[model samples]
Target: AGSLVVLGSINADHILNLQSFPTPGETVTGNHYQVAFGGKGANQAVAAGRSGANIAFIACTGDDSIGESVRQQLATDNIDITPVSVIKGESTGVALIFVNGEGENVIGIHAGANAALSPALVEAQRERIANASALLMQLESPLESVMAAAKIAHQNKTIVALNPAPARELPDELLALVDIITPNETEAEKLTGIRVENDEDAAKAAQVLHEKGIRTVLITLGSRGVWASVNGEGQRVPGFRVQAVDTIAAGDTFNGALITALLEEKPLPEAIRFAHAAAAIAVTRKGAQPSVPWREEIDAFLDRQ
Candidate 1:
């Protein structure tokens, strides 16, 4: 009610920290390994929730240990899980993340129970999405569920912020239902077939999405910053510098912070700046959801800069 709603996957991420990624079929040694509570949806929800948003989380998980862990974590975050669906006898969704010393990561996701999330289940939570200020979604869940949530949010006049990560092409109807689409450079290239090598190219790619009826498009340029176009107007926001340990959930943190700021009626540019600050803080820490900073930590970091 205060800010955002996130409807999508809830997974347990298994991370392997290595010096460098293995070559195709080659074997490589890992420096560390850990299991962290993560899922694009869950990460974004925690990001916003810890930052002071009253978040509703609608997702599906298997009735297993992983699912139980996810439920406990969401409960701790005060995320509403009333809309969540738990399937019997299946494994919860899981992500295998390989992070190099440079903070860059490559992810392989297995949807598992996330793939079972249906549009009908999302429709059942229509009221939750309808009542929220903004809806944050990602591709980690089934496409049908994502589309269903987006459509319901649009119909209820809720602003929809779609983070098209693990990008894929979508139908025009879905595009039309979104108010803002946040994609990184690789995601932009996947969506628009244009390489976002610079701000100008990123703006052009955003325009292409805008022409598809999406009102606003934002492309995250890693350390370079963010490029945004809204209602035919475009601008670039610089990224903050930081000593990054892991970049796994930086984008999710950004989306979460952005949604919270927007719900507080902050202007778009200011919201993006705030989100960038939160993401910078996230990358400085290790792990996914655990890396997301608390509200006070983010505020203190911003104040010092």
Candidate 2:
């Protein structure tokens, strides 16, 4: 397999644990506060790099200190960040996150520099994007730029893996170019108007995507597991049972690990298993990027199971 390319958003993520959501004229305080390296683009890139893949990251970060800091950190993970761009005027993207006492979390995003990733930026990496084995992307970036990258990859016969996060409707023109689509239940519902409840529901959702020209459909079912379908033929892949504390980057971990395993020439079923193990390890820990296990930990954890 050739090297992989991942394009999207990177951010400085902040979180607080509060008693509950604040109402109008309410003053609520949190007992805990934390900050971490995040953004689906960075998290997945970090996850794949940590999982031992020859990967490159294409994204836009602000010129702020947070942006500079993450770039330095990403290189240590073995991700090629040569294409990571810095927007001079915009602030770094950030997630204003808060969790309730019950572990229910709410998030608000400040797109900032993430929005600055333009079609021109994607076009600038035309040579790199054309040669990759697979191009993995998330919806955190602008749809037009994502579409541009997808078109480039598709034209070159490279695999296109799209994780439609934040739940948005996509045009068939964009969906048709995607070789693989990894969406959670909500995203599936948003795209196909299907509420994924059981294996049959996932199959139903996959059929719709397949009809739209997507070859593979993976609907992430949280703790239940992932339902992977290729061309209307699919089955349920069970996830490891572990006590999960935080699930912030769980999907990103799954997508990243999945891509790395596939790039290593593993079978689709086994690749999903590898991804599940990695995501299991992630959810059992706290934070986003830090929770992503290395290749050694992933193999060791899978070995014990």
Candidate 3:
């Protein structure tokens, strides 16, 4: 199988589990706290690697202890980190996450070194970007770097799978280069100016994106399932029902598993099902990268479904 190259961010996450989210100007005590390795790019890379995909991660980290720790965390998944750089005089990216008993979460992030991922740095790894079976990207890193990597990946005939997390307006030129675009409901609304509360709304959003030149669109509706459009045809893959303990990495798991399924040549519907299965498992666990299930676990979960 061809390897998936991810160009994104790496961060250390500080999480606090509370009974409920705080109200305006209120203080809520947390019952538990944990530190985890995270970042949209890093989480997806680890998920894909654990799900049995050959993966490489390219990003920037600080020249500090947190950076070293994040690097070691990624190495545990056997993802190639040769292209990850340590930028001096910068602190590693960090996220302060607060989760409630209902598994919902709110997060604040400091991009830090993530903002240091430059277009030139991405261009320097031209071979890696071009050689990849697919280049997975997210918005956590610099937009310029993301665009640069996508351009190179397209030139090399590699499929570009973009997960537009923490969404922002994307240039038409950049969207044209993406083979598949995955966005959650909230992100879809931001990107397409269409409220995505149901499958029908999701289709509309997907249609808008399709008109922008993206080959395929997958809009993830958390707990509702995924609504996908390919070549103007739309389908909704129902989500698996489970008691979610923490939903932090569920989207990352879905994106990672989706790419692996596509790389294995699975049909679009089947791939969505596989990703849904992986994400179902993730929501039942805690933490970010640590919550992503392995390939065996995903397959077993699917079998039961």
Candidate 4:
């Protein structure tokens, strides 16, 4: 398999573990606080790299200490960061995450330098995108840049896997260029106007997305598993049941591992199972990039299952 290229966002995440979500004008003390490396793009890059894939990342970060730290963190995973641009006078992107006792989370993001990743910046990395076996992208970056990279990857025969996070309406032109789309229930509902509370609902959403021009629709059902529709055939891959401690970045881990499995030529069913193992391990732990398992850990976890 060729190298994987991720074009996305970079952020320093500040997390607070609380007993429950705070209501309007109510201040509640959290049980715990921690800082971790996050951002959809960076998390997925680290996840793929840790899962033993040759990965490269391209994005924009602020020219500050936070940005420097974010870049250094990605480098630690052996991910190529030569295409990461640092913009002056901008702050690094930041995400404020609140995790309740049940492991559910709510996040607020300040785009900061992430918003600076324009189509021009993506054009500058044309060579990287062209050489990749697959390009993994998320909506955290500029839509135009994401579309630009998808166009380039499509032209070069590089597979494009889009994770439509922070759910938004998608244009058909952009949807047509995507080879695979990984969207959680909320994202799927927002994108297709279909509720996804069960396997049947997920399938309906997948069908609608498939009709919208996407070649494959993989709807993540959280603990219920993933429903995949490829080539007009659909299946529900059961999720690995686990006690989730923190659900943040679980989807990112799934996306990264799914791409790695696919790049290794694993069938869609097996690939989804592999991704589920990785995500199960992730949700059982805390933090974002820190929770993503390595290849050995994932294999061992799957074996024990």
Candidate 5:
């Protein structure tokens, strides 16, 4: 795998696994709780790194023990952390993840220093971003920072893939800069005003984004596979079957594998298929970054199939 530059948030995720999620305003008991390093940036970086990409992660965290643990974990994964900064007065970002036995998850993120990122920081890392084959980002960080990275990637002629998770309102100008935009069902609804009930809805959503000048749109439907449209050509990539334990980091895994597959010069459909496979395996495991599979594991799993 070649280089992948990830620009987004870094968080210490506190997770609670339950038999079932509580209803609105209702309380339910959790079966287990675990703390893990999970930020869209960190999770994707770790995922891509494990999938054989030389990864560089750029983000900011507070100078605290939690931040220390997050950095150490990234180091163990062999990700380049030189671009990661520690803000003196802020705290590391945190995510509250609730995962049910059915492989569904709800996440609440408190972006700390992540929200304080400046365009200057992104410009300072211009060389690194330029050297990368692709730049991966998420909506977890400051919008301006995301835009800055996207601009840099665009200027460098690198593929800019945006994983628009925790979807919120964004400007069309920013969307136009991305080469590929990945949004799940709920996120697609948020961005395109189309309720993604199935594959048809996914196509409508992708069409909406493409109309806004985004060339490629990938709408991920957990376990159902992915709906993809590139340059107006659309297809449904079927997901592999797996007994899911937790679906915490499945999207991050897909983003990671997608970038790796693209760097290897695979066609978009084949890359998306590989990503779907990686994410299927991810949902069957627990934890966030730890749940992501290595390249050999993914290859072996596919070979057996």
Candidate 6:
């Protein structure tokens, strides 16, 4: 398989575990506290790298120590960070997460340098995008940068896989550039205005996307599994059984691993199964990149089944 390029954000995640979400200016400290590397793009790139895919990253980080550390961390994960530029006079993106006892959480985000991933930077990486076999992206960075990357990838015949998280209404020009899209239930609804309560609902949601030119749609339904569709016909692909811990980057893992399998020549159905295995392992662990399974682990997880 040829190399893959991931264009997105990199963030520092600070998590605090409490009994319940604190109300306005109230101080109620509790269970655990940890810091992890996160960001939609960074998480997905880490997932792909851990899965042994030849991948590179294009993103922006602040001119701070945190940013420097994450760039080093990506190298440790075996992701090429040649295009991960630094933005001066900005802070690294950060997420302050408060998780309650019931596995629910509330998050506050600071885009920081992530907002500096401009179309001009994307223009500088035009050659890299053009040469990649696939370009995987998320909505964490500026939409204009995403659009720039998508257009370059499309014109060069590179596969464009978009994970429209924090879902928003996207233009047809952008949708038409996408070859595959993976959105969770909320994102699916935001894109098409159809709630995905059942398989039929998933099909209808996907239909709306198809009409905009996307050929493949995968709507993830948490524990129930995923609604896998291509064009208009599709089915529900069940998820693997596993004890859950943290579900932070589960969906990101699925998107990254799915494209890896597809690049390795697996058919869509088999690729979804591979992605399911990757995500199953993610939920059983904690943290963002830490939860993502490695290539050997995914293979082992499949063999046991």
Q: What is candidate 2's local distance difference test score?
A: 0.92
Residue range 174-280, candidate 4, lDDT tens digits: 98898899998999999889988998888888988888777888988766678889856788778888887778889999999999999988988888889989998
Candidate 3 residue-wise lDDT, 123-203, digit = tens: 899998888899999998888899999999889999999999888888888888988999999999999899999788988
Which wins on TM-score, candidate 5 or candidate 6?
6
Residue lDDT tens for model 6, 1-305: 77999999898999999999988999997799988999999999999998888999999999999999999899999899999999999999999999998889888999999999999999999999999999999999999999999999999989999999978888788988999999988999988888988888888999999888899999998778998888888888999888888989988999999988988889999999999999999999878887888999999999999
Clashes of each: 0, 0, 0, 0, 0, 0
Greater-lDDT candidate between 5 and 6: 6
Off by over 4 Å in 2: none
lDDT of 2 by residue, 1-305 (tens): 57999998898889999999888799898999888989999999999999999999999989999999989999999899999999998998999998999889989899989999999999999999998999999999999999999999988978999999979999999999999999999999899998988878889988999999999899988667888899989888888898889999999999999999999999999999999999989998878998999999999999998
- How many clashes does the backbone of model 6 have? 0
Worst 10 residues of 5 by lDDT: 219-228
| Residue 279 displacement (Å), model 3 | 0.4
Model 2 Cα RMSD, 1 decimal: 1.1
Pick by lDDT: which candidate is best?
A: 2
TM-score winner between candidates 4 and 5: 4
lDDT of 1 by residue, 20-104 (tens): 9898899999999999989888899889888878888888899998798888888887677777788998899998989887767
Cα lDDT, model 6, residue 166: 79
Off by over 4 Å in 3: 19-29, 100-104
Q: TM-score of every model? A: 0.93, 0.97, 0.95, 0.94, 0.91, 0.98
Model 1 lDDT, full chain set: 0.86
